Design a protein around this ligand. Structure first.
Ligand SMILES: Nc1ncnc2c1ncn2[C@@H]1O[C@H](COP(=O)(O)OP(=O)(O)NP(=O)(O)O)[C@@H](O)[C@H]1O
Ligand SMILES: Nc1ncnc2c1ncn2[C@@H]1O[C@H](COP(=O)(O)OP(=O)(O)NP(=O)(O)O)[C@@H](O)[C@H]1O
Ligand SMILES: Nc1ncnc2c1ncn2[C@@H]1O[C@H](COP(=O)(O)OP(=O)(O)NP(=O)(O)O)[C@@H](O)[C@H]1O
Ligand SMILES: [Mg+2]
Ligand SMILES: [Mg+2]
Ligand SMILES: [Mg+2]
Lengths: 306, 307, 302
DNA sequence: TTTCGTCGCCCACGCTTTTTTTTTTTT
């Protein structure tokens, strides 16, 4: 995550760097990942200047066929934040993978928010316990953030109550556009420190409301595609683990409320089901590296256990 | 908290403010909540000055990344409107919470409207009962709004009828769009006043007959979702606690709340009420992000919810 | 009851009013209380006209909210037709509450049906009401019972007891139009109450079959939605009646449809001899108890 | 030293939504 000032020393002046920063490119990776057609619509950058900055950005960010034994080593070195439950972290063959998107969908009262709250504390656990030793981004679009759960999880894990709530940074999206701006601000502020997680609670819930009718289906899917592409860019350029949450719909018998856009974009999906009492069930979905099966986890006072 | 007028103090000419208010944006926070898609939809407001409506309003609200310590400090500010029972209080850990939606569902005679009446009384009461201050907003379609029960509940709490029944409203229109329109109007009603509880009992009772048959289900569910979302906006913007009771359907494949998968997610708290013995009922916390899976027996009496 | 000439003299002056009257939902309260979908299939296709009529006919008793004391006073002067017995002066808190939706069950054709051929004591007494109804789904209405009951009190008149009580209904799709057209004479003259004898008694006589049960339940939901609309708009006390099912797992026909579309339901049981013990059920402001009724050849009371 | 002319050419698809609804007594 090299800051945007890295290319400032090489060619690009301060004015252009400021224009990029106000555009939303707070890192060299964000500039390098964007196409040439996107570094043109932002005023203040010429076409030749755009090609120049693209060349300089590509000088540091690795692209193309370079080496893949190193990438296999990197995949073996994936952080794999643990869920906190012995069956959820085993069904996922380690837990939530980092650098990808882990959508979880269920009917209701299925433990999606409970899992997010547990992960917001477990991402601060060292690699010995399973985590990333970093902060926790919490984009919460339902007003469903209860720090008491985080304190309970921390006291279960024997961590300081003040530390976990100091690490966790919280923001609430009020619409889809504001969700995108919140994502941009998160990208801006994720370079100043290390963030081991990024939670988008009900990543597609305001889409169900803001876009009404069939006439807005294409625009809604395009906006959701842009949002998921931005989330993927955050996942690669930062190495964070994005655990987004999805709702469910009935086939007029359940299916995630996102179309094929979110089905393809989401690297992993989890189907959460209500079991008996406090226990629930989790099933893998659309995971290219995981089998299809079920799990067995419970919602205790200490987040998610068994 | 603050009026819409501040927007025209920032440098937008009053005609644009009146156009924004005509669409329903009776507060600066409300217009900030809506995205640019809902701002371009206002007639006479194009993409021009849209930034002057978005970022100028956003400069007056946080709309950013706080810390969890600050949110936990704000968590003490919550009023936590209190019920009438001590066991029920232990169930909800102090009572229903401020700025959230509680949906209570069950069969007939499960104490729903009694809970609504008692909660509105505690909202029209000092902090000693559990609610800070504010009027009680009623939105009745099922028809159980009998001010006889309001008068009866007023005797136990020792409040004169002049200052309680004149402080509570009523809904006359039995239409799905009527509740949304009346809540948009209650927005401007409450921006000039203070409110603590907002009750919409027939949250999904209207949709059982308004949209009948498979084929019209989708439009019904988009309508319900839009109503729920603007209800959540109203709850958050003014820190009001919302109650929305629900009906049940028997699974013929055994009672399930109606309008599922749309009201299930939106309702941040769900209370499942069962009939017990005599007149006592049992309230179980169906859905909650903080409260456990507990059950509390209460006994509706003349005083109120009772225990 | 607001049959004001404003409904036709407003900005809308065209065939739209006559289309609305012919569609079966007339009077102004058929507009501001009706969804937009109903104003689609009616003859005359204009979505702009829907909101035009809505704007021009939403100017009624406060619909842009109100205060609860304004109609709390209105329901302090409410009729509240007292029951035809002096034993229920403690229970029921007076009489049959007007503007509510009371439900009776426990019997098939006797019992609660007798409670249809009685009461109206407040109607006879002071002015006053002097009005009563009768609807049916599968019933055996007998006006001689009304004659005998009125003769018990000081209401000795004969013709005044007639020309009000409907006595029709055998098949659901037959009395669909009956409950549609009730308003056609309900607004011409003011009116007190409305019993629906054997209402939605056994829909499985015609609306029968698995898979069909859902459509049946939608039909009942529509019917009591209209019934609630009429009860609240005209300020009348409606009495729905059903029959038991003998649970094999003491409940009435209707399931969760009429269960969530009533106000003051109350079970009717059998006592000793002519004693018809009348227990109570869900009610916003009535403590649970059991009443004591009696039926005799003269009528219901004692 | 002199003195302007003269139009042609089409491309190219995107996007799912949404649950309802209880009968029925034997011996
Ligand atoms: N302290 C606690 N102890 C035990 N269980 C709890 C506790 N707090 C919450 N729960 C359980 O967690 C459930 C809610 O889980 P949640 O993660 O909010 O579901 P969800 O699928 O996110 N629902 P929604 O967000 O409305 O779509 C509750 O209904 C309880 O069963
Ligand atoms: N006008 C009336 N006056 C007095 N008694 C009446 C009158 N009408 C009906 N009854 C009584 O009601 C009785 C009906 O039989 P009952 O023993 O109640 O049958 P049930 O099976 O208990 N009732 P149901 O549930 O309607 O089938 C008659 O036989 C009479 O005793
Ligand atoms: N004074 C009282 N004393 C004791 N219990 C009471 C009293 N008033 C009301 N109750 C009880 O509280 C219940 C509240 O029911 P209510 O909340 O009206 O159900 P509902 O689901 O809204 N009705 P419906 O429209 O038929 O589905 C009553 O039915 C009684 O059981
Ligand atoms: Mg959950
Ligand atoms: Mg109730
Ligand atoms: Mg009968």
């Amino acid at each position: 995550p090299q800051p945007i000032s890295r290319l400032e020393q090489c060619g690009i002046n301060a004015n252009d760097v400021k224009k990029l920063e106000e555009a939303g490119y707070h890192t060299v990776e964000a500039v390098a990942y964007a196409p040439k057609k996107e570094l043109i619509n932002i005023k203040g950058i010429s076409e030749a200047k755009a090609d120049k900055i693209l060349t300089e950005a590509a000088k540091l960010v690795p692209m193309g066929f370079t080496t893949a034994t190193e990438f296999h080593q990197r995949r073996s070195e994936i952080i794999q934040i643990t869920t906190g439950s012995k069956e959820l972290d085993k069904l996922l063959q380690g837990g939530i993978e980092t650098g990808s998107i882990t959508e979880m969908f269920g009917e209701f009262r299925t433990g999606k928010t409970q899992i997010c709250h547990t992960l917001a504390v477990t991402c601060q656990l060292p690699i010995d316990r399973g985590g990333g030793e970093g902060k926790a981004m919490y984009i919460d679009t339902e007003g469903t953030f209860r720090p008491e759960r985080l304190l309970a999880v921390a006291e279960r894990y024997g961590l300081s109550g003040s530390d976990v709530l100091d690490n966790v940074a919280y923001a609430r999206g009020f619409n889809t556009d504001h969700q995108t701006q919140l994502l941009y601000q998160a990208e801006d502020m994720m370079v100043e420190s290390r963030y081991a997680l990024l939670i988008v609670d009900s990543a597609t819930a305001l889409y169900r409301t803001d876009y009404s009718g069939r006439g807005e289906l294409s625009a809604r899917q395009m906006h959701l595609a842009r949002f998921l592409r931005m989330l993927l860019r955050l996942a690669d350029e930062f190495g964070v683990a994005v655990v987004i949450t999805n709702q469910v719909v009935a086939q007029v018998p359940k299916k995630p409320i996102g179309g094929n856009i979110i089905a393809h974009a989401s690297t992993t999906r989890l189907y959460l089901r209500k079991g008996r009492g406090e226990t629930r069930i989790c099933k893998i979905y659309d995971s290219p590296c995981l089998p299809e099966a079920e799990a067995m986890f419970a919602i205790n006072a200490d987040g998610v256990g068994d």
